[PDB]
């Protein structure tokens, strides 16, 4: 499964994910490519800021969905 992550910079990164991955698991994937601590990340799907501990399925995030990475601090 693959989703896209955009950033304020606007660079489009793609991630390999599992449908039952938590948002916390997605932040740890972004950490490894980008160097940003999870607690500094904030992720929007379709205008909605996502809560860690919930899963991509919980939010109907599926092949080719785009998440928007925003930084806290």
How was this structure determined? It was done by X-ray
Q: Does domain 1-73 have CATH number 3.40.430.10?
A: no
Q: What Cα–Cα distance (Å) separates residue 58 from each residue in 10, 19, 30, 49?
A: 26, 9, 20, 13
In Å, what resolution does this model reach?
A: 2.2
Structure tokens given for 24: 């916390």
Structure tokens given for 26: 């997605």
Q: 């948002």: which residue's tokens?
A: 23
Q: Which long-range contacts (CB under 8 A, 24 or more apart) does 33-36 make?
A: 34/7, 34/69, 36/69, 36/71
Helix (H, G, I), strand (E, B) or coil at 45: strand
Helices (H), the chain: 23-34
Question: What is d(CA 36, CA 25) in angstroms, rounded to the nearest whole number?
Answer: 14
* Domain locations along the chain: 1-73
């Amino acid at each position: 499964l693959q989703i896209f992550v955009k950033t304020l910079t606007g660079k489009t990164i793609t991630l390999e994910v599992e449908p039952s991955d938590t948002i916390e698991n997605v932040k740890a994937k972004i950490q490894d490519k980008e160097x940003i601590p999870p607690d500094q990340q904030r992720l929007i799907f379709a205008g909605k800021q996502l809560e860690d501990g919930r899963t991509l399925s919980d939010y109907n995030i599926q092949k080719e969905s785009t998440l928007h990475l925003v930084l806290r601090l």
